[PDB]
Every structure is written in structure tokens, then in C-alpha cells.
Amino acid sequence: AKDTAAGHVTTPCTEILFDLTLAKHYENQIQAAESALNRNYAAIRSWTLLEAMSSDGNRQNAYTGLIAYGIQITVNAEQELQGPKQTKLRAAHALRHRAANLSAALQIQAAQQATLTKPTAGGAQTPFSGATGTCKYEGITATAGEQSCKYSTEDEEKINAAHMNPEVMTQITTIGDKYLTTITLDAIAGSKGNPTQSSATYAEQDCQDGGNPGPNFGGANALGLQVTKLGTKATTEKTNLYTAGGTECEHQPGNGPQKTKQRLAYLVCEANKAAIITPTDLQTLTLDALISAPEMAAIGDALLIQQLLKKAYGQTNEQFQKNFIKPLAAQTVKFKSNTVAALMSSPNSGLALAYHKGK
Amino acid sequence: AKDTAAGHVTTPCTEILFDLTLAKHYENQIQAAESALNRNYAAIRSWTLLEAMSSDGNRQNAYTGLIAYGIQITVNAEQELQGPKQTKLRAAHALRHRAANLSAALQIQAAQQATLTKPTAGGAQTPFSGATGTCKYEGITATAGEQSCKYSTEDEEKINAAHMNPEVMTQITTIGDKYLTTITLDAIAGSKGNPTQSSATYAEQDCQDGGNPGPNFGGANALGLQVTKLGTKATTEKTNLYTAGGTECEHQPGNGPQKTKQRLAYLVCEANKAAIITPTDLQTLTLDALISAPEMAAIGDALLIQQLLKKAYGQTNEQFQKNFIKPLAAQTVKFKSNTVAALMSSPNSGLALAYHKGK
Numbered sequence: 001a002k003d004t005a006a007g008h009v010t011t012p013c014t015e016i017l018f019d020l021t022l023a024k025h026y027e028n029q030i031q032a033a034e035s036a037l038n039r040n041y042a043a044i045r046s047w048t049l050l051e052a053m054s055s056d057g058n059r060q061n062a063y064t065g066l067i068a069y070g071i072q073i074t075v076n077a078e079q080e081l082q083g084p085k086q087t088k089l090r091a092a093h094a095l096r097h098r099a100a101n102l103s104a105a106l107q108i109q110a111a112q113q114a115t116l117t118k119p120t121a122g123g124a125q126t127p128f129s130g131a132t133g134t135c136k137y138e139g140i141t142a143t144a145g146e147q148s149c150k151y152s153t154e155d156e157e158k159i160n161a162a163h164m165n166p167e168v169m170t171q172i173t174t175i176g177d178k179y180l181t182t183i184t185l186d187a188i189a190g191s192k193g194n195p196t197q198s199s200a201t202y203a204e205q206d207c208q209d210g211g212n213p214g215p216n217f218g219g220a221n222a223l224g225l226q227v228t229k230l231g232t233k234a235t236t237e238k239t240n241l242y243t244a245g246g247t248e249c250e251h252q253p254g255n256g257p258q259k260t261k262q263r264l265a266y267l268v269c270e271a272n273k274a275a276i277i278t279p280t281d282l283q284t285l286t287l288d289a290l291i292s293a294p295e296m297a298a299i300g301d302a303l304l305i306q307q308l309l310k311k312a313y314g315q316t317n318e319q320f321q322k323n324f325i326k327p328l329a330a331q332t333v334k335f336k337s338n339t340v341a342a343l344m345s346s347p348n349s350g351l352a353l354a355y356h357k358g359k
Numbered sequence: 360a361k362d363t364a365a366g367h368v369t370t371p372c373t374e375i376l377f378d379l380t381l382a383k384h385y386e387n388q389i390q391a392a393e394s395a396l397n398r399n400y401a402a403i404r405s406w407t408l409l410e411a412m413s414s415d416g417n418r419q420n421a422y423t424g425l426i427a428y429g430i431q432i433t434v435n436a437e438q439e440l441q442g443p444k445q446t447k448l449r450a451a452h453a454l455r456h457r458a459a460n461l462s463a464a465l466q467i468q469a470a471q472q473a474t475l476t477k478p479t480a481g482g483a484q485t486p487f488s489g490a491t492g493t494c495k496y497e498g499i500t501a502t503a504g505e506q507s508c509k510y511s512t513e514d515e516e517k518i519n520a521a522h523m524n525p526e527v528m529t530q531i532t533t534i535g536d537k538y539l540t541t542i543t544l545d546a547i548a549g550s551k552g553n554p555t556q557s558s559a560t561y562a563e564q565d566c567q568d569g570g571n572p573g574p575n576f577g578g579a580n581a582l583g584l585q586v587t588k589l590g591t592k593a594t595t596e597k598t599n600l601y602t603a604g605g606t607e608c609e610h611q612p613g614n615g616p617q618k619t620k621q622r623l624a625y626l627v628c629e630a631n632k633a634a635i636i637t638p639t640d641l642q643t644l645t646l647d648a649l650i651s652a653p654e655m656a657a658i659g660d661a662l663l664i665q666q667l668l669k670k671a672y673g674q675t676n677e678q679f680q681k682n683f684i685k686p687l688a689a690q691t692v693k694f695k696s697n698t699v700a701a702l703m704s705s706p707n708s709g710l711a712l713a714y715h716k717g718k
């Protein structure tokens with residue numbers, strides 16, 4: 001189904017959640033690819049130690065073949081990751097920036113009740129040069145308590161990385177810009193009698209004199225105003241990621257001024273298109289994956305073709321695991337103690353290699 | 360001198376610049392350390408190829424010693440980087456979040472001129488149950504054009520990574536929270552005559568009747584209000600990074616509610632304390648740096664002590680550079696073509712190794 005996550009964005013808080021969840025999805029895709037590279041480099045260090053520890057030329061050549069394979073695919077994958085990584089990080093950064101902006105706006109747009117100050121009475125004065133009474137208030141303020149976004153179980157289910165694979169995303173939903181830019185308020189003035197500069201009894205936060213000044217314009221003459229509410233209403237808007245044909249990103253930059261929603265849509269589209277390719281996980285390699293790997297044809301030809309690969313690595317995956325995979329975790333190495341893979345990722349890694357290459 | 364950069368923060372825009380400049384400084388420290396690691400791993404791949412290409416056992420052992428050294432120091436440095444990296448990224452993320460917040464607030468606090476709507480006249484009505492005239496305005500708004508921060512040459516000189524080494528930073532300066540939270544406005548009411556529900560001539564964005572209604576309360580009876588300005592004034596505040604003794608971070612979390620400035624100060628202090636250690640640059644290694652390296656004592660003992668190291672690597676740095684450093688950039692490798700270091704960081708890296716290990 002398309003757009004489950006964006007179609008649940010109906011409020012400032014749900015846009016925030018979408019933006020941060022999608023940013024974290026892109027960041028997690030990069031972290032997962034880098035973790036995979038680091039696992040592969042760890043495997044290569046482990047096989048380098050095992051090569052140094054074997055005395056059989058054919059077993060040594062087999063380890064060399066796994067080192068060579070590993071270096072080739074992992075160096076390549078690390079190079080190929082960089083473009084998608086930068087694309088995805090540009091979008092993650094922008095999404096986090098937007099979510100920050102919107103959260104800050106939310107706090108201000110929650111300031112919906114005003115505190116009046118004590119006014120000063122006058123007669124005619126700017127901007128009412130024709131008035132006989134004025135009541136002037138300076139520094140009326142509105143502030144809210146600390147706001148927070150509260151999410152339901154379903155909000156977190158629907159606005160979730162599980163719904164943010166590229167094949168399902170066609171649009172983003174954003175709050176209209178006026179929520180970010182505009183202060184909105186209602187206000188009312190009230191008059192009784194003949195208010196003038198002498199209406200200087202201010203106990204009710206208005207200007208009164210005559211009679212018995214008091215609550216609800218008790219006095220003979222009164223003038224006042226109240227700001228009865230503030231706050232701009234949020235609206236939502238939809239922006240397509242792709243052009244009509246569905247391939248190309250809409251909202252490419254450089255074609256004229258753009259709105260926030262259009263810049264975000266472009267970045268999201270490009271980050272969705274920039275798919276990451278992860279290489280094989282060397283630490284869990286199977287025999288069939290090794291001998292079917294395209295890079296192993298030339299590597300095998302150089303060191304030893306699929307017939308030759310089985311002779312070196314095993315006729316069964318059981319044999320392959322036994323000889324080339326299980327030793328990473330289970331084989332202890334002691335000299336003057338740790339298992340192969342942990343040792344070759346530890347502070348003694350290089351020394352372990354020097355020691356066994358020397359012995 | 361202390362606090363050149365924070366002492367130039369006097370405005371919202373200069374706080375933004377400080378926050379983003381310091382975030383980028385931390386991000387650049389991490390990028391520089393990772394670049395250094397990647398250069399070292401590239402050198403290790405290069406020496407692995409040269410080991411495979413030599414036929415002299417003693418030259419082979421020498422390359423093995425550089426591989427072992429490189430692995431040890433680079434794996435260690437990569438492990439040791441992770442804690443400081445995470446600390447520095449927590450601060451960079453928070454600084455960028457703050458700068459976003461403040462930029463969003465700046466846009467709203469620039470909305471300083473109101474647009475009045477056409478009012479509706481009444482008599483007594485809430486919140487003026489004692490009035491004889493009211494003039495009620497709904498949806499008064501204030502919006503600014505797109506704001507931007509403009510920096511002088513000196514702003515960029517003083518609020519600069521060159522002034523953000525830890526030894527010079529004792530405090531941060533931040534805008535007061537009210538700029539982020541509070542709407543401020545001035546407003547004035549004006550009255551003439553006996554305004555009532557019949558004061559329903561609205562051409563001047565006030566309530567008039569009687570006589571000849573017009574500009575400046577031309578009519579006999581008038582009531583109106585104007586919002587004459589909006590905007591909350593920025594203030595600045597200083598927060599110390601360290602406790603009085605100067606070692607420990609002030610504002611540790613977990614001791615009670617904190618303000619934004621205190622959370623930021625804590626994160627900045629921890630990111631400043633979490634110094635990164637970069638290992639030696641293997642691609643520009645000198646002979647004296649190699650034989651003075653502590654790790655080379657055991658590695659040399661294992662493969663070959665400083666006397667033995669000079670026998671393997673050269674009695675002069677000229678000889679060392681000739682035999683072990685210059686070949687990385689200058690030695691061409693061809694088989695069925697590239698220089699050593701570029702080849703071992705290219706898509707043919709592993710195959711180049713397999714080819715020469717087989718030949």
C-alpha cells in the first residue's frame with residue numbers, strides 16, 4: 001500500500017514524528033552498511049592471521065583467496081557507499097532541521113492566552129488623533145507551558161521505518177508555512193460613557209473614572225481592550241516526490257524559488273532513489289556463495305575453475321564452515337590468549353600477526 | 360585568550376553562527392580522524408601487495424612488520440575514537456537543534472507589524488459585560504518577510520573554529536528563553552462619542568456612526584483598537600562549562616530540571632574534554648618515527664632491537680623512504696595497470712593481491 005506513514009501526518013506533532021523517523025531510517029541504513037563493512041574488514045584481519053599460522057601451501061593459498069575476495073568486495077562496497085551516504089545524510093539533516101523548526105513553532109503557537117499589563121489613559125494620541133479617550137497597553141504577553149508531543153500506539157506503528165521503504169513512498173505531508181511565520185490573535189475594545197485622560201483608575205486593567213470604578217466597567221466612564229485569544233491554526237499540504245512519469249524527482253533545485261516542502265520532497269526523493277548495496281557478509285559466507293561469486297573466478301584462476309575452488313574450499317558447506325568460518329570464533333590463539341576474530345580486532349592484533357609470521 | 364568566540368555572541372544571529380560553527384568543528388574533528396584511519400588502512404593494503412611482490416625473505420619480513428604495526432595502531436585508534444566520536448556528535452546534534460530553534464524563533468519575532476481585520480460593532484458582550492460599545496476584531500495577524508542572518512568579516516573571524524580549541528573555552532552565551540516562548544505586543548483602544556452596536560461603518564477598520572464617518576474618527580461616535588507593535592526582545596545569558604575547580608563539567612544531568620543553556624553547556628564541556636588521539640600517518644612515516652614507536656619493539660623482536668630495525672628498514676630516512684614509502688605512489692603494477700596505493704584502493708585491489716601471491 002502506498003503512503004501509510006505520510007498519510008498519518010495530520011498534525012504538527014505527527015509531522016515531527018514522520019520527519020525524525022525518516023531521518024533515523026536513512027541514518028540507520030548508513031550505520032547498517034558501515035557495520036557490514038567493518039565486519040568484513042574484521043574477517044579479512046582474521047584470515048590474515050590464519051594464513052600466517054598455516055604451514056600448508058594449499059591451505060595458505062585458500063586463505064589468501066578469501067583475503068583477496070574480501071578486500072575486493074569490501075573496498076568496492078565502501079567506495080560505492082559514499083554517494084548514497086551523502087545523499088541520504090543531506091535528507092536526514094534537512095528532516096531533522098524541519099522537525100526542530102516545527103517543534104519551536106509549536107511552542108510559540110501554543111501561547112494562546114494573553115496577560116494584560118496595567119494601561120495608561122490618554123486623550124487624543126497616535127494612532128487615534130480623533131479620539132477623546134485612549135487606553136494604551138504596553139508589553140502584553142502570551143506564553144505557554146512546556147509543550148510536548150504525545151503519540152498513540154497506532155501513531156508509532158504507522159509512522160514507522162517499516163513503512164518507509166522506497167517502493168511505498170510517493171508524497172510527503174507538511175504543515176503550512178503560516179504556522180511557522182504568522183502570529184494570529186483576536187481582540188476587542190470596550191467603551192462606556194466619556195473616557196478621557198482622567199479615566200486613570202486602573203484596578204481592572206482598563207481605564208475608568210467617575211462614579212464607583214470597578215469590575216465590569218463599574219465606573220461612569222470606561223475604556224479597555226482585551227486580547228481574547230492567540231494562535232495560528234495548522235494546515236496540511238501534500239507534495240509529490242516524483243514527476244508524473246514516476247521515475248524522476250520533482251522539485252529539482254535551480255529552476256526558481258522553492259518552498260520548504262518542495263526542497264524536502266526533493267531530498268527525500270533523492271535519498272529514496274540512492275539505494276545502498278551491501279556486499280556479502282564474509283563472516284557468514286557459505287561455500288556456494290563463495291564459488292558462485294563472480295570475483296572468485298579470476299581470484300581462483302590466479303591462485304589455483306569452480307572445480308578448483310571446491311578442491312581448495314571444500315566439496316560441502318560443512319567442510320567449508322569447518323575449515324574457514326568456524327575457526328574465527330572458536331580457535332584460540334595463545335602467545336607471550338584470545339580467539340582468532342577477537343584477537344585480530346583487539347590491541348594485540350598486529351603483534352599476533354608479527355609473532356606468527358616470525359614463527 | 361579565553362572565550363573570543365562566545366564573547367562575540369550578542370544577538371540571535373551570532374548565537375546561531377556560534378552554534379553551527381562549533382557543531383561543524385566537532386564534526387570536522389571526527390572526519391579528520393576517520394580520514395586518517397582510512398589513509399592508514401590504505402597503506403596497509405599497499406604494503407600487503409608489496410609483500411606479495413617481493414622474493415627476498417628479509418624484505419618480505421620488513422613489509423610484514425609495517426603491516427603488523429599499521430594494523431595494531433589503526434585498529435586501536437579506531438576503537439579509541441568511538442567514545443569521543445559519540446560524545447562530540449551528541450553535542451553537534453544539540454547545537455544544530457538549538458540553532459534551528461533559534462532561527463525559527465527569529466522568523467516569528469520579526470513579525471512586528473500587524474494587519475487589522477474589519478471589525479464588528481456590538482454593545483455589551485463578553486469580556487465587557489458593562490460596555491455600551493464594543494468593537495471586535497477576529498484574526499488580526501502579523502507576518503514578516505523571509506529573515507536572514509548577515510555576518511560581518513569580523514563576526515566570521517571571531518566566531519570561528521580557530522577560536523574553539525578546548526583550552527580557550529570556559530562558557531557559552533545563549534539567548535534567553537523568552538525569545539523562544541513568548542509573544543509580546545503593544546495595543547491601544549480609542550473612543551469618541553457614544554459608540555454602540557449601531558457604529559457599523561467599518562471603512563477605517565474601526566467602528567463608527569453618526570455625523571460623517573471617516574479617517575481619524577471622523578464620525579460622531581467611534582471605537583477602535585490597533586496593535587501598534589509586536590516582538591519580544593532578545594536577551595543574552597552566560598553559562599559556565601566547568602565547575603569552580605575547572606576540571607569537571609558543570610550542569611551534569613540527573614540532578615533536577617535543567618534549562619536549555621545548561622544542557623548545552625554540559626554537552627559542550629564533555630565534547631571539549633573528549634579529545635581525539637590520532638595515530639601516526641603511515642603513508643608519511645619516517646624511519647625515526649618507526650624505530651621510536653613503542654609497538655615496534657615487540658614487532659621487531661617477533662620478526663627480526665632498534666639495531667635490528669635499522670638493518671631491516673634502513674640506516675637513513677632516505678633509504679627508508681626509498682624502499683618502503685615512495686613505492687606506494689610511484690611504483691606501477693601491471694597485469695592481465697596502476698600505481699601500488701591507488702590499485703590497492705581500487706576495484707582490482709583484491710585481484711592484484713591474488714595475482715601476485717599466485718605468481
Ligand SMILES: *[C@@H]1O[C@H](CO)[C@@H](O[C@@H]2O[C@H](CO)[C@@H](O[C@@H]3O[C@H](CO[C@H]4O[C@H](CO)[C@@H](O)[C@H](O)[C@@H]4O)[C@@H](O)[C@H](O[C@H]4O[C@H](CO)[C@@H](O)[C@H](O)[C@@H]4O[C@H]4O[C@H](CO)[C@@H](O)[C@H](O)[C@@H]4O)[C@@H]3O)[C@H](O)[C@H]2NC(C)=O)[C@H](O)[C@H]1NC(C)=O
Nearest residue numbers: 094097098101253254255256257258260462463466506507
Ligand atoms: C528552518 O527554519 C529556518 C528559519 O525560518 C529556515 O531558514 C531560512 O531558510 C531560508 C531558505 O534557505 C533562508 O533563505 C535563503 O536566504 C539566502 C540569503 O539571503 C540573504 O542573503 C543574500 C545574499 O547572499 C541576499 O541575496 C538576500 O537578499 C538576503 O539578504 C538566500 O540567498 C536564499 O535564496 C534562494 O532561495 C530563495 C527562496 O527561499 C529564492 O528567492 C532565491 O532566489 C534563491 O533561490 C535560487 O537560488 C537557489 C540556490 O541556487 C536555487 O536552488 C533556487 O532554485 C533559485 O534558483 C534563501 O533566500 C533564510 O534566510 C533562512 N532564515 C534564517 C532566519 O535562517 C530553514 O529553511 C528551515 N529549514 C527547514 C529544512 O525546514
Ligand SMILES: *[C@@H]1O[C@H](CO)[C@@H](O[C@@H]2O[C@H](CO)[C@@H](O[C@@H]3O[C@H](CO[C@H]4O[C@H](CO)[C@@H](O)[C@H](O)[C@@H]4O)[C@@H](O)[C@H](O[C@H]4O[C@H](CO)[C@@H](O)[C@H](O)[C@@H]4O[C@H]4O[C@H](CO)[C@@H](O)[C@H](O)[C@@H]4O)[C@@H]3O)[C@H](O)[C@H]2NC(C)=O)[C@H](O)[C@H]1NC(C)=O
Nearest residue numbers: 103104107147148453456457460612613614615616617619
Ligand atoms: C528546541 O526547541 C524544542 C521545542 O521547544 C525543544 O523541545 C522540548 O524539549 C524539552 C526538553 O527535552 C521537552 O521536554 C521534555 O518533555 C518530556 C516529555 O514530557 C511529557 O511526557 C512525559 C511522559 O514521558 C510526562 O511526564 C510529561 O508530563 C509530559 O507530558 C519530559 O519527560 C522531559 O523531562 C525532563 O526535563 C524536564 C525539564 O525540561 C524536567 O522537569 C523533568 O523532571 C525531566 O528531568 C528530569 O529527568 C531528566 C532525564 O532523566 C534529568 O536529566 C533531569 O536532570 C531531571 O532529573 C522534558 O520535560 C519538550 O517536550 C520539547 N518540546 C517539544 C514541543 O518538542 C528542544 O529542547 C530545543 N532543543 C535545543 C537543543 O535547544
